[PDB]
C-alpha cells in the first residue's frame, strides 16, 4: 500500500523509481553521469536533487519511504559534517596495500580481504593521512547519499558494510577492529530497508516531500537488481546473461570459496550467494552482432546437440565456477555453418551456468528450484531451452530487473519476505 521511492546510483548513472504498490503504478526518471569528474560527490548529490526534481509533485507529496542503493566499494572520507576530505575511492579502483595488515581485524578468507574492498581503502587512506581523526567517518556511496536525506552520520547497511569488515553472520565488527585506529570511523550497521530516521525538514519542504517521510537503510546495486526479480524463497536464483554470466542464488546457508571469489551477503533470515564467470555475451559479440545473433538463433534446434563442446572464454583467465588464471578460450573446432557454431557457443555458456549453479549447491547452498533470467541473453529462447534442459529447473524472464525498482521494494517492505514463516 506504501508509496515508496527507490534511488539507484550505479556505474554510469542514476535512476529514480517511485512506486504505488497498492495500485502497482510507477514513475521513473534518469540522470546520466559524466564520463569522468573532478568532484564526484558533487555529481552524485546534484544527481540526487535532480532526480528528486524530475519526479512529479503529486508523486512526491505521497512518498512515505525512501531507499538508496549504491556501487559496492565506492567510499568517501568525510568529517563529522559529512564533507569529503579527499577524492572518493571508486568501486573498480584497487589499493596497493598488504592484506596481512587486515588479518587481525577480520576472520580468515573474509570478503573484505581484497584490494578493492572498503576496509582496504580505509587502511589505505590511513596510510597517507598518517593519523585519521576519530571524529571523521568512512561512508559508502549509498551511505553518503542517504546521509544527504536523513542527516544521521555514520549509518550504513550490512550489504555495504560487508567488505568494510562487518561480519553479518554474527552481526558485528570484531572487537579488534572496533578498538583499533579505524573503529571511530566505522558506521553503525543496520538491516537494509529499516528506517534510519525521518527526512530532513528543510529537504522535505524544499522538494515538496512529506516531512514524515522515512529514509531507510540502503544496499548495493547488484543486490537491488536481485531484489527487482521478486524472488524470496530459498533455492530461487537470478541469472544475469550480460557481457559476463552472473549467477545469484538464494539459500538458507552462507557458502564461500575464496579461490573463485564466491561469498555470501546476508539477506533477512536467508543468504544471497553467487558468482561470476568471465564467459558471457562478449564472446558472442566476437563473432556476430546482435541482429545476426538473432538471425542465426532462429535457425538453431536445441534438441539436437551440435556435437561441439566449447568453453566460451573471451580472453585469458577464468574465475567461476572453476578458478584457472591460465585457461584458454576453447572455441575449437569451429565448423562450417555459423548456425551450429552459434549453437555450440550457446551450449558452452549453458554449461557455464549449469556448472556454476551445481557448484554453488556443492558448496552447501540450498538446491536450485527455479531460475529468473535477466540481461541481454534473457530473451533468447533457444539459449533458454538449452539452459532449462541442462539445469533441471523451470526458467523464466525476471518480471523486473531495474535496481531502482528493487530498491523501491526495499523501501516499501524491507527484507521481511526473506524469512521462514
Ligand atoms: O548506471 C547505472 C547502471 O545501470 C545506474 O543504475 C543508472 O540508473 C542507469 O540506469
Ligand atoms: O556495485 C558494484 C560492485 O562491483 C558495481 O558497480 C556493479 O554495478 C554491480 O552491479
**CA 2 from centre of chain:** 24
Question: Contact 190/155 with Cβ under 8 angstroms?
Answer: yes
Give the cell for residue 287.
Answer: 563473432
Nearest residue by C-alpha to atom 6 in ligand 1: 10
Supply the residue whose CA is at minimum distance from atom 9 of ligand 2.
Answer: 222
Residue corresponding to grid cell 579461490: 259
Print burial letters for 206-219: b (CB count within 10 Å at least 16), e (below 16): ebbbeeebbbbbbb
**Which pairing describes strands 214-216 and 195-198: parallel, antiparallel, or unpaired?**
antiparallel
Closest CA to 397 of 417, 369, 377: 377
The distance of Cα 277 from the centroid of its chain, to the nearest Å, equals 15
Question: What's the CA-to-centroid distance between 93 and ligand 1, angstroms?
Answer: 19
Query: Buried b / exposed e across 298-334, counting CB within 10 Å, b at 16+?
Result: eebebeeebebebbbbbeeebbbbeeeeeeebebeee
Nearest CA to ligand 2 atom 4: 72
What does the H/E/C string look like for 225-292? HHHHHCCCCCCEEEEEECCCEEEEEEECCCCCEHHHCEEEEEECCEEEEEEECCCCHHHHHCCCCHHH
Would the CA dihedral through 12, 115, 109, 131 be positive or negative?
negative
Ramachandran angles phi, psi of 123, nearest 5°:
-60, -45
Query: What are the phi and psi torsion angles at 379 (to 5°)?
Result: -85, -10
CA–CA distance, 41 with 232 (Å, rounded to integer)? 34
23 CB neighbour count, 10 Å cutoff: 9
| String of DSSP letters for 320-342 | SSS-BTT---B--S--S-HHHHH
Give residue 11 CA to ligand 2 midpoint distance, Å: 7
The angle that helices 381-390 and 338-362 make with each other, rounded to 10 degrees, is 40
> In this structure, are residues 82 and 185 in contact, taking their beta carbons and an 8 Å threshold?
no
The DSSP 8-state label assigned to residue 376 in this structure reads: G
CA–CA gap between residue 185 and residue 291 (Å, rounded): 51
Q: How far is CA 48 from CA 42, 53, 306, in A?
A: 10, 9, 51
Is residue 259 within 8 A of residue 323, CB to CB? The reply is yes
DSSP state of 164: G
390 to each of 348, 393, 395, how far by Cα in Å?
Answer: 11, 9, 11
Task: Report yes or no: 414 and 216 within 8 Å, Cβ to Cβ.
Answer: yes
**Cα–Cα distance for residue pair 58/391, rounded to 1 Å:** 47
- Count of alpha carbons within 13 angstroms of residue 277, beta-carbon side: 31
Asked if residue 275 lies in contact with residue 360, where contact means CB atoms within 8 angstroms, the answer is yes
Whether 56 lines ligand 1, by a CB cut-off of 6 Å, is no
Cβ proximity of 350 and 311 under 8 Å:
no
| 118 annotated binding-site participant | no
Query: Cell numbers 568512512 correspond to what residue?
Result: 138
Instruction: Give 399: exposed, middle or buried? Use CB within 10 Å, 0-12, 13-18, 19+.
Output: exposed
What are the Cα distances from residue 230, in Å, to 40, 233, 238, 370, 416?
32, 9, 10, 13, 12
- The experimental method is X-ray
At a CB cut-off of 8 Å and minimum separation 6, what does 186 contact?
138, 154, 164, 165, 173, 177, 178
The residue with cell 555450440 is: 344
Q: Count the neighbouring beta carbons within 10 Å of the beta carbon of residue 33.
A: 16
Does the beta carbon of 15 lie inside 6 Å of ligand 1? yes
Asked whether 347 and 355 are in contact (CB, 8 A), the reply is no
Cα–Cα distance for residue pair 252/262, rounded to 1 Å: 16
Contacts (Cβ under 8 Å, ≥6 apart) of 4: 18, 19, 21, 63, 64, 65, 66, 67, 408, 409, 411, 412
Return all residues near 37 (Cβ < 8 A) that are at least 6 apart: 43
Amino acid at each position: 500500500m506504501v508509496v515508496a521511492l527507490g534511488l539507484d546510483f550505479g556505474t554510469s548513472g542514476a535512476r529514480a523509481i517511485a512506486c504505488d504498490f497498492d495500485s502497482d503504478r510507477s514513475v521513473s526518471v534518469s540522470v546520466t553521469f559524466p564520463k569522468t569528474s573532478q568532484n564526484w560527490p558533487q555529481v552524485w548529490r546534484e544527481a540526487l536533487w535532480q532526480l528528486l526534481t524530475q519526479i512529479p509533485a503529486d508523486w512526491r507529496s505521497r512518498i512515505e519511504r525512501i531507499a538508496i542503493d549504491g556501487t559496492s566499494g565506492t567510499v568517501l572520507l568525510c568529517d563529522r559534517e559529512g564533507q569529503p576530505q579527499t577524492e572518493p575511492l571508486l568501486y573498480n579502483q584497487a589499493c596497493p596495500i598488504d592484506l596481512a595488515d587486515l588479518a587481525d581485524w577480520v576472520p580468515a578468507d573474509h570478503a573484505a580481504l581484497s584490494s578493492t574492498s572498503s576496509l582496504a581503502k580505509l587502511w589505505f587512506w590511513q596510510q597517507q593521512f598518517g593519523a585519521l581523526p576519530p571524529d571523521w567517518q568512512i561512508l559508502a556511496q549509498a551511505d553518503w547519499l542517504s546521509l544527504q536525506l536523513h542527516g544521521c552520520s555514520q549509518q550504513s547497511d550490512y550489504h555495504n558494510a560487508l567488505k568494510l569488515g562487518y561480519s553479518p553472520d554474527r552481526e558485528r565488527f570484531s572487537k579488534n577492529l572496533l578498538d583499533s585506529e579505524l573503529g571511530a570511523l566505522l558506521p553503525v550497521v543496520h538491516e537494509p530497508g529499516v528506517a534510519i530516521g525521518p527526512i530532513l525538514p528543510a529537504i522535505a519542504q524544499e522538494f515538496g516531500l512529506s516531512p514524515d517521510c522515512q529514509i531507510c537503510a540502503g544496499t548495493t546495486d547488484s543486490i537491488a537488481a536481485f531484489l527487482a526479480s521478486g524472488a524470496h524463497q530459498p533455492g530461487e536464483a537470478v541469472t544475469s546473461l550480460g557481457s559476463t554470466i552472473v549467477l545469484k542464488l538464494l539459500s538458507q546457508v552462507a557458502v564461500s570459496d575464496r579461490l573463485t571469489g564466491v561469498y555470501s551477503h546476508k539477506l533477512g533470515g536467508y543468504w544471497l550467494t553467487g558468482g561470476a564467470s568471465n564467459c558471457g555475451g562478449a564472446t558472442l559479440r566476437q563473432f556476430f552482432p546482435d541482429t545476426e545473433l538473432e538471425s542465426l538463433s532462429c535457425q538453431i534446434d536445441p534438441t539436437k546437440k551440435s556435437g561441439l563442446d566449447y568453453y566460451p572464454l573471451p580472453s585469458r583467465g577464468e574465475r567461476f565456477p572453476i578458478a584457472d588464471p591460465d585457461r584458454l578460450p576453447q572455441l575449437e573446432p569451429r565448423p562450417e555453418n555459423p548456425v551450429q557454431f552459434l549453437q555450440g557457443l550457446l551450449e558452452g555458456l549453458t554449461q557455464v551456468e549449469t556448472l556454476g549453479y551445481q557448484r554453488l549447491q556443492d558448496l552447501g547452498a540450498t538446491p536450485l528450484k527455479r531460475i529468473w533470467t535477466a540481461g541481454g541473453g534473457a530473451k533468447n529462447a533457444v539459449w533458454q531451452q538449452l539452459r532449462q534442459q541442462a539445469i533441471g529447473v523451470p526458467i523464466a524472464i525476471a518480471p523486473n530487473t531495474e535496481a531502482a525498482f528493487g530498491t523501491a521494494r526495499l523501501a516499501a517492505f524491507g527484507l521481511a519476505a526473506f524469512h521462514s514463516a
